[PDB]
Amino acid sequence: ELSALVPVLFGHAAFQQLNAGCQLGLFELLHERGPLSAEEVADALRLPRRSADILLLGTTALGLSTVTDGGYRNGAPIGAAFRDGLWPVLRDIVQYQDKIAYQPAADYVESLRTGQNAGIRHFPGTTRDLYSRLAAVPGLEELFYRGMHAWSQLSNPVLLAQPDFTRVHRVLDVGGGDAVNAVALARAHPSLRVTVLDRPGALEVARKTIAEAGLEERVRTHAADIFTDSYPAGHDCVLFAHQLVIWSPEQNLTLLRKAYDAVEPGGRVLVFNAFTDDDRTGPLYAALDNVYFTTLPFRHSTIHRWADCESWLREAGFTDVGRTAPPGWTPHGVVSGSRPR
Amino acid sequence: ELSALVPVLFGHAAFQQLNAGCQLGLFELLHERGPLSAEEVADALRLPRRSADILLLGTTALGLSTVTDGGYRNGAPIGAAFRDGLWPVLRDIVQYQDKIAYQPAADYVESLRTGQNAGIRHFPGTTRDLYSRLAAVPGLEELFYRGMHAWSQLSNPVLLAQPDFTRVHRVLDVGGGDAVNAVALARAHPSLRVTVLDRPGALEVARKTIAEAGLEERVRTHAADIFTDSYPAGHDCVLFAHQLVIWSPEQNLTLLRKAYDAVEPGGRVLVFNAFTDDDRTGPLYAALDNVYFTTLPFRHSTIHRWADCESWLREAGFTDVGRTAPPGWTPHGVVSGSRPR
Ligand SMILES: Nc1ncnc2c1ncn2[C@@H]1O[C@H](CSCC[C@H](N)C(=O)O)[C@@H](O)[C@H]1O
Ligand SMILES: Nc1ncnc2c1ncn2[C@@H]1O[C@H](CSCC[C@H](N)C(=O)O)[C@@H](O)[C@H]1O
């Protein structure tokens, strides 16, 4: 039946409702002061009455809000997010979709046809990857990492629960960004020490992330190019978090070989990101999130299958290669290998 | 729970997958030559293999396609559209979303906050309505009406099944666009004669629609401004198809009172468009489609509730006012009235 096509055919509109609910302060208002009538919403949020009605209709029909009494409350997924302490995280990733993902997504068809990340044209600069363009605009880098920080807060529980971090001590965070994951690791495991490797632009945000955690003595930054520069020696654990999704399989092989050469024998390699199921049918998250990867970061970015990643670890020379999957939310998992002695 | 938020959070990406499947010719390919391997798709569609994989994961995960065999076929909603002869309709409304709706949708938050159709900025010009701006870009007016045509072909069976058309003979099509509905009515009812009222630019497309149905002697075009000019006298029936959703309630009143003055006493008024449920909870189609009306056509545009429409008819002076809401056809219906003798 073709009624089924309506939510896809209007998917962008569906997103815009969540976008508006967040940006316009609806969900937080309902959280602190619900239930509220449409006219109370309009007055609170300073919206024209027609505007509140349209918004409330949008969020109510999607299940983001519920209406009884002619009074409005947050719906179950929203209320759930508040309950679990995940609202600022949810709010921030929505901002990201809005400010970073949405408009480049329009270049999806061209990006597929030409194999280019055509969506990057919306950002000043001439380099062919998104990250080296973040520096081109004042405050852009900070906005981007506010986003990434939040995505990792959402997905790094599976990382933090990784058995290896009770057994390793010195982690190399390759492309560690704003050091969100270094810090989360350092906090959960006081034994641990982490080197955050990234572009200088990222590391300026990293220092601030490190400084407000007071983790300057166990978490440090090091500026390098992940391809052309050497990975710092004397590390126990090489971590790739939301990294290998950016590059082609051959580039990934290159990165993993550097991980191998640099890591202490008996050490571990960890690949942490979303993964496409090996049967290529999902999950929905990877399937959808790939529109971002096809249009923006780099021309070969895509969410790879577990089996493909595992293959790269073995062909880099790692052993004991395997995966850690379920939490629930999402396809985030860890693929891991050991450097043999 | 927040897994639920995923299709909304990536709502724009879901649409883009559908968008790509249409534009790149995937669904048509699968229809005539499925089942196919990923690599067969890649070669046929002239896509890089990595592109074919990313696309196929998206459509498969969405159910737009299915994978068994390791061979790909159209999923149920897509195949159903082909079987029912609705494929070109689906194709054209997807093209309309892509070229007309998707980017102005980003101006939703701003549109809500200011009560303006802020999305109109994506179109060259300075007038306050979308329709008078279409001529500024070559082929835009026709591309637009190609889009309107396809939407009406999808929803006007409820209109064609409206009982009044066995009791009326001369219908006035107020804001009749490319005459998709005038022609469809004339076909369904050989008794009928229709006057299509619209801007000259629209009527140029209307003439063509009329000519290729060969209905030039029963369906004619008349250039007028629906607000500042009088409606032609001597009509049995005044029809508003996808029209009142554009204007404010005060404006809808002005238009309906004009219909009142122009229609023969004992004549009928028909308002045909999508409707919002009186309980303001849905349907989803109306709730989402509002993103387009808030951002693009005009500063007051919105999908009104049945009851609000009914109320305007009665206050314009019509009697016997009621609704027709065929099951399966939601959110499309007709609100109708009579001019008293
Ligand atoms: N050539 C390069 N040298 C250094 N860092 C690079 C790089 N190419 C990409 N990166 C970094 O790779 C990161 C991708 S985003 C992931 C950031 C962080 N690990 C997290 O999980 O939240 C960005 O910080 C980008 O600056
Ligand atoms: N001031 C005006 N005068 C005449 N036509 C107008 C108008 N403002 C809007 N319209 C027309 O209103 C229509 C809105 S779209 C509806 C088209 C047609 N009724 C259909 O159902 O397919 C457009 O054709 C637009 O040109």
3-state helix/strand/coil string of B150-167: HHHHHHCHHHHCCHHHHC
SS3 call for B112: helix
Q: Are A38 and A72 in contact (CB under 8 A)?
A: yes
Question: What crossing angle do the helices spanning A200-211 and A140-155 adopt, rounded to 10°?
Answer: 60
Measured between CB atoms, does B249 come within 8 Å of chain A?
A: no
Query: How many alpha carbons fall within 13 Å on the CB side of residue A162?
Result: 29
The amino acid sitting at B49 is R
Q: Are A126 and A82 in contact (CB under 8 A)?
A: no
d(CA A79, CA B1): 8
Dihedral sign from CA coordinates of B4, B10, B12, B14: negative
**What would the DSSP string read from start to end of B230-283?**
PPPSSEEEEEEES-GGGS-HHHHHHHHHHHHHHEEEEEEEEEEEE-B-TTS---
May I ask the CATH architecture of the domain B137-278+297-341?
A: 3-Layer(aba) Sandwich (3.40)
Residues in chain A: 341
**What are the C-alpha distances in Å from A207 to residues A96, A201, A204, A211, B144?**
22, 11, 5, 6, 52
d(CA B125, CA B272): 29
**What are the C-alpha distances in Å from A78 to residues A153, A157, A256?**
17, 20, 39
Q: How, if at all, do strands A36-37 and A71-74 pair?
A: antiparallel
Resolution of this structure in Å = 2.6
Measured between CB atoms, does B150 come within 8 Å of chain A?
A: no
How far is ligand 1, taken at its centre, from the CA of residue A151, in Å? 14
Facing residue for A10 by CB, picked from B57, B108, B288? B288
- In B, which residues are within 8 Å of A294 by CB distance? 51, 54
Neighbours of B262 (CB within 10 A): 19
Ligand 2 pocket check for B225: Cβ under 6 Å: yes
d(CA A320, CA A341): 12
The full 3-state SS of A150-198, as one line of letters, equals HHHHHHCHHHHCCHHHHCCCEEEEECCCCCHHHHHHHHHCCCCEEEEEE
SS3 call for A258: helix
The amino acid sitting at B325 is A
Ligand 2 pocket check for B148: Cβ under 6 Å: yes
d(CA A60, CA A52): 12
The amino acid sitting at B228 is T
Q: Which of A3, A5, A247 to mutate to test the interface with B (most CBs of B within 10 A)?
A: A5
d(CA B338, CA B313): 9
What is the Cα Rg of chain A in Å? 21
Return the residues preceding each gap in chain A, C–N over 2.5 A, or none: none
Enumerate the CATH 3.40.50.150 domain ranges in chain B, comma separated.
137-278+297-341
Q: Which residues pair with A173 in a beta bridge?
A: A196, A239
d(CA B150, CA B298): 21
Residues in chain B: 341
On whether B243 is known to bind a ligand per the annotation, the reply is: yes
Measured between CB atoms, does A282 come within 8 Å of chain B?
A: yes
Ligand 2 pocket check for B309: Cβ under 6 Å: no
d(CA B132, CA A161): 59
On whether B242 is known to bind a ligand per the annotation, the reply is: yes
SS3 call for A332: strand
CA nearest to A332, candidates A147, A160, A81: A160
Let me know how many helices (H) and strands (E) chain B has, helices first: 16, 9
Q: Any idea which ligand is nearest the CA of A209?
A: 1
